[PDB]
Structures are given as structure tokens and as C-alpha cells.
Write a protein that binds this ligand. Structure first.
Ligand code: X3Z
Lengths: 286, 65, 275
């Protein structure tokens, strides 16, 4: 083919990824459903902040998926002790993530696997959502989903209570967690199980009631907790300005309907106010 | 330098779709199946289903191959 | 969404003459490769079209009898897969009986209708050895089908556009007091449209609107006001021409005949046994 293998990048549980000459090639049930999901969704989408399926082909069961090669991801940036995340850098990452998510949601697709490692960065500082192996189309009535999606530290409380039907909130809450991970340089709510994740959520952000979440008791796996006051958001994020606290509070609203959407988040004063988001050229290199 | 929000400009080749926030007040939501409390707790409403149905009905209606 | 989908960009065609050209090209290319590899056994493009129509009906029956209940979106995706595959491939190179099962299998995967492979092949009304051999054939043709679809798997059916149009009529068209009386006949017309090549020539929204308006005209409620005011006079004229052409396509459709299908089935089996 035109794609000659150049270097090895890594191996995943469902496929192996290597850099080919510059692109990234990802390699009785038939073809893997994760690969089919990624193919069927990335062929229907085209946005600057969404990973692009440049080409696809293969032999028998194994399929080669061609993607643009990405230099790094947000997880490496966050975990990089040497790197310093100014509010401008945080704004830029948040803006690119939210623009990609807004495009994805306008086409009725939930990513459902949002985490810093799934936000890839190229050499030009353009952030792209990757790993659509869990993504699904949303908006169809009477079509139950699964509540186990999203890595636990980023899983929304409605999911942890067993929500079969949901919307963009499951991405939005994950986005908030990423934002928290961008501000603290450490994961925000590192639970050990579903109950521990719910406990950390309800300890840091207070337990919610019917006043904040009217129909929470109807979720099949709803568990009653003790009442925690919850740390005020300004104590958790001391260096954050008022607009950033407004954005975080909107992202972390317990009611997923009231939770701010990607478009609503992009219209918030946080992105409009000074300083502006850092251009991709000057974004930190890990 | 400072960011300014701009709505996504994607041509639909069809009639304009009413905004999701206006579906209830324009009478659309009275012709869709109501969302159960479980669905509402999950964050899913009948507004989303109605908006998706209308967006698909109006998409590409005026487009010539 | 359809308006920037792969279906609109690559799998919607200007006229049935381009479709006939693609099918004739497939027939000619297979004839060339077969005569090079080393005759009246060959099938003409019209015979191929007759066989393809017959096996599309077979795929429809298979999906209608499928257990668990296969959603109609999956069935539409599978039928579209069949049409797209046999646009650029010959039934003499790939048997339609296997390709239709592969289409249903791939559609079940793509439409997120989780069905286990043994429970998929359990619907094939054959002996267990027959089901296992058919499963091996399906798994060997899955990648071929995906390649011939050019890795364009999402198929926009007219069913959700149909629902959106019905909601819009209920909301903004009190002239049609009960838009639900139109559902039966418009669905029948949608099926008849699916029989023809309209799915490769018109947008799903146009197909749904044409079915709805055909049902309305059949029941006598002419409702041009919905197009004129609720939905550019040139745009209205183009829309009306599109619907008229689609109705003509439904009018001129000829179902395959028993004797024709029998003769073509023996000819196709002869083609596959030889070469
Ligand atoms: C779209 C996708 C196929 C892609 C594109 N680039 N890329 C890279 N490049 C360099 C890199 C190195 C370290 C941390 C982030 C990055 Br980015 C690695 C990688 N890792 C594979 C390993 O099997 C997994 O799929 C994880 O995504 N995947 C990709």
C-alpha cells in the first residue's frame, strides 16, 4: 500500500497502533464492533477538533484505520510536572474540547469516553477528540444505552445511578472533571468503585436532593447517602476566577438537564473574558 | 485575540428547524411521547427526540444531486 | 446528519442512466475477467437486475422473520447495503444469497442491534451444518462487503424523516386535522419506493415527503399549502419535479416473474458452479 510502517507507537486491548509514513495506523464474531463503530462514526464527521479517519482498508478480520498522527495527549500535559498550565492554556484546551463536543452533539453523537488521554494534541496545538470506540448516536427514543460508559473518575452521577437514557450531560460532566484535572494537575474524583465514586462526588460537591435533582429517586440504581455539606467551589479552586467557578458549577450541576451544554458553555463569560485562549502554536509541549 | 462565540454554520439544504428551547412553546412537544421520570433523571427529554425527528425531516429536502 | 453524510456525497446519483451504466460496467468487467481467466452462460445486466430484485425481496422476508425483532432501521441499512454492493459488483462474481446475509449481518453490527453470531445464523432456516457454513461464508464476505461499500456504513433511512414530517404536520398544519390517517398508505408507498432505485437517487427526506404527499393525494387531501407556505418558487418547482419523478419510478417498477427468476436462478447457479 501507500502506507509503509515507520515506527511503533503502542498496543491497545482491541487494536495495535503504529506510526506509518505521517499517519497513525490502527490494526466467529467477524470484524470487531469497536472498529466498526469508529469507522461508521468518523466517516460521517469532519471537524478540526475531531480525529479524522483519513483512510480505511484491511484483510480478513484485521482492518487498518488511518488517522492523523497526534504528537501528545492532555493526560501527558497534565501529568507533566515541568509543564505549567496558565489560565490561557486551560482556556484554550477547554475551548477546543468544547468546540469538538459541540460539533459532535449537533450531529447527535455522544463520545461517552471523555478523559485527558482521549484528547490528543498535534504539533500545531490543535486538540482533537479521539477513541470513538465507545461513541454512540443519541436522541432516539425507546433505545436503551448502557450506564457503564466513561472511565469511572469521569463518569457522571446519573450514570453511576444506572441511567439507561441520557444526553450530552454524560460528556459535559466528564468535561468538568477534565477541567478540574487541568486546574489541580491531579484527578478530581479518583474513586475505587461505583459507590466510592459516588461518595467522592457527594463529599466534594455535597449530596443532592430533589430540589437540585427532581427525579433522582427514579434511577434504578439510586442509593441514598448521608448528607454532606460539600466543599465550596472557591475553596477547591482557589486560583480560579469567578467566571471559571461559574463554568465549573454549570458543568457539575447534579441535574443533567440543567447541566450546561457545549454550546451554552462556549457562550459563557469565561471564554469571552480576558485573557484569551492561547494559540495552538504557543501551547506547552510535553 | 479574545474568543467570541459563533454558531456552527452548516448548510442543511432544507427548511429551518425550530430551536430546541422553543419546541415546547411552539406546540411540537404535544405530539411526541412524553419523557418518563427515569429518562428525565438521566437527562433525556422528549424535546431531544422531537428535535432529531424534525432535523432529519428537513435535512436535504431541497438538495439536488 | 444526511446533509453532510457519505450517502449524500457518494451514494446518491443524478439519474437511473448513471446507475445502469455502473451496473453494465460491473457486468462487462466480470465478463472480461472471466473470459480472460478461461459464453452464453453469462448474464445480461437486465437479468442481473431481476435477480437482484428477487434477492432484495428475499432479504426483506429474512429480516421480517428475524428473531429477536430486527428494527426497521437495520432492515433499511441492509437493503441499502445490498443495492450499493450490486451497483458495482456482479451477481456472477458474488452470489446474492450470501451477500444479502452478509448485508444483514453488517447492518446489525452497524445499527448497534447487538445479536450474537449463533443467534444470527439460527434465523437462517437451514440445517445446523447449513447455518455454520453460511456463517463462515458471511464472515469471509464481511470485509468484502465493507470494502465495496467503500467503508461508508451509516445509512440514512426515510423513517425518521417520516416521523419528523408527521410531527411537523401535527404542529403547523391544522388543515390536515389528523395527520395520522396518512401513516398506513404513506408507509406502503415508502415500501414501494424502497423496491425501486429511488434510495440511490433521492434524499431520505424527499422520499418521506413524497410518500406522505402520495398518501394525501390518494386519500384526497391535496395539501400543497404545506409546501408553499409552511416549508423560492423555483425550489417548490424542483421539489414537485422530484416527487413526480419518484412517483413515476414507483409506477414503472415491474416485480420479477416466477419463470424469469427460475431461469435466471439456474443460470446463476451454472455461472457459480463453473469458473
Ligand atoms: C488516533 C490514534 C490512532 C492515534 C493518533 N496518534 N496516536 C499516538 N501518537 C503519539 C502519542 C504517544 C503517547 C501519548 C499520546 C499520543 Br497521541 C499514540 C496512540 N496510542 C495508541 C496505542 O495503541 C492508542 O490507540 C492510544 O490512543 N494513538 C494515536
Amino acid at each position: 500500500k501507500r502506507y509503509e510502517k515507520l515506527d511503533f507507537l503502542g498496543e491497545g486491548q482491541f487494536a495495535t497502533v503504529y506510526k506509518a509514513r505521517i499517519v497513525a495506523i490502527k490494526k466467529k464474531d467477524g470484524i470487531n464492533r469497536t472498529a466498526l463503530r469508529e469507522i461508521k462514526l468518523l466517516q460521517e464527521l469532519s471537524h478540526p477538533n475531531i480525529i479524522g479517519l483519513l483512510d480505511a482498508f484491511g484483510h480478513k478480520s484485521n482492518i487498518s484505520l488511518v488517522f492523523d498522527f497526534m504528537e501528545t495527549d492532555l493526560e501527558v500535559i497534565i501529568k507533566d510536572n515541568s509543564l505549567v498550565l496558565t489560565p490561557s492554556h486551560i482556556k484554550a484546551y477547554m475551548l477546543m474540547t468544547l468546540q469538538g463536543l459541540e460539533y459532535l452533539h449537533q450531529h447527535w453523537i455522544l463520545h461517552r469516553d471523555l478523559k485527558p488521554n482521549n484528547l490528543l494534541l498535534d504539533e500545531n496545538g490543535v486538540l482533537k477528540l479521539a477513541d470513538f470506540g465507545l461513541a454512540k448516536s443519541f436522541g432516539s427514543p425507546n433505545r436503551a444505552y448502557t450506564h457503564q460508559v466513561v472511565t469511572r473518575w469521569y463518569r457522571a452521577p446519573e450514570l453511576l445511578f444506572g441511567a439507561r437514557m441520557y444526553g450530552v450531560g454524560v460528556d459535559m460532566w466528564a468535561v468538568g472533571c477534565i477541567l478540574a484535572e487541568l486546574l489541580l494537575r491531579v484527578p478530581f474524583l479518583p474513586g475505587d468503585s461505583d459507590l466510592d465514586q459516588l461518595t467522592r462526588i457527594f463529599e466534594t460537591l455535597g449530596t443532592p436532593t430533589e430540589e437540585q435533582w427532581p427525579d433522582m429517586c427514579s434511577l434504578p440504581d439510586y442509593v441514598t447517602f448521608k448528607s454532606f455539606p460539600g466543599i465550596p467551589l472557591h475553596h477547591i479552586f482557589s486560583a480560579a476566577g469567578d467566571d471559571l467557578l461559574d463554568l465549573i458549577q454549570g458543568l457539575f450541576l447534579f441535574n443533567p438537564c440543567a447541566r450546561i451544554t457545549a454550546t451554552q458553555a462556549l457562550k459563557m463569560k469565561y471564554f469571552s473574558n480576558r485573557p484569551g485562549p492561547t494559540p495552538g502554536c504557543q501551547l506547552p509541549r510535553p | 485575540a479574545l474568543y467570541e462565540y459563533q454558531p456552527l454554520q452548516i448548510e442543511t439544504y432544507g427548511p429551518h428547524v425550530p430551536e430546541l428551547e422553543m419546541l415546547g412553546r411552539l406546540g411540537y412537544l404535544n405530539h411526541v411521547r412524553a419523557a418518563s421520570p427515569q429518562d428525565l433523571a438521566g437527562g433525556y427529554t422528549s424535546s431531544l427526540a422531537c428535535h432529531r425527528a424534525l432535523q432529519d425531516a428537513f435535512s436535504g429536502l431541497f438538495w439536488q444531486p | 446528519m444526511y446533509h453532510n453524510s457519505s450517502q449524500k456525497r457518494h451514494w446518491t446519483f443524478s439519474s437511473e442512466e448513471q446507475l445502469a451504466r455502473l451496473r453494465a460496467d460491473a457486468n462487462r468487467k466480470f465478463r472480461c475477467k472471466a473470459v480472460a481467466n478461461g459464453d452464453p452462460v453469462f448474464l445480461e445486466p437486465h437479468e442481473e437486475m431481476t435477480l437482484c430484485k428477487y434477492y432484495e425481496k428475499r432479504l426483506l422476508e429474512f429480516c421480517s422473520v428475524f428473531k429477536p425483532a430486527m428494527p426497521r432501521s437495520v432492515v433499511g441499512t441492509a437493503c441499502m447495503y445490498f443495492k450499493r454492493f450490486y451497483l458495482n459488483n456482479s451477481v456472477m462474481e458474488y452470489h446474492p444469497r450470501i451477500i444479502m446475509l452478509t448485508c444483514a449481518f453488517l447492518a446489525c453490527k452497524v445499527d448497534e442491534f447487538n445479536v450474537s453470531s449463533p443467534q444470527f445464523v439460527g434465523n437462517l432456516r437451514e440445517s445446523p451444518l447449513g447455518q455454520e457454513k453460511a456463517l463462515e461464508q458471511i464472515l469471509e464476505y464481511e470485509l468484502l462487503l465493507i470494502q465495496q461499500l467503500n467503508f461508508h456504513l451509516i445509512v440514512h433511512n426515510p423513517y425518521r424523516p417520516f416521523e419528523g414530517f408527521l410531527i411537523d404536520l401535527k404542529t403547523r398544519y391544522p388543515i390536515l386535522e389528523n395527520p395520522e390517517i396518512l401513516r398506513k398508505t404513506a408507509d406502503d408507498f415508502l415500501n414501494r419506493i424502497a423496491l425501486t432505485d429511488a434510495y440511490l437517487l433521492y434524499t431520505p427526506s424527499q422520499i418521506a415527503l413524497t410518500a406522505i404527499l402520495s398518501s394525501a393525494s390518494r386519500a384526497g387531501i391535496t395539501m400543497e399549502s404545506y409546501l408553499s407556505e409552511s416549508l423560492n418558487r423555483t425550489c417548490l418547482s424542483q421539489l414537485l419535479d422530484i416527487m413526480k419523478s419518484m412517483r413515476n419510478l414507483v409506477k414503472k417498477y415491474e416485480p420479477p416473474r416466477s419463470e424469469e427468476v427460475a431461469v435466471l436462478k439456474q443460470k446463476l447457479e451454472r455461472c457459480h458452479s463453473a469458473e
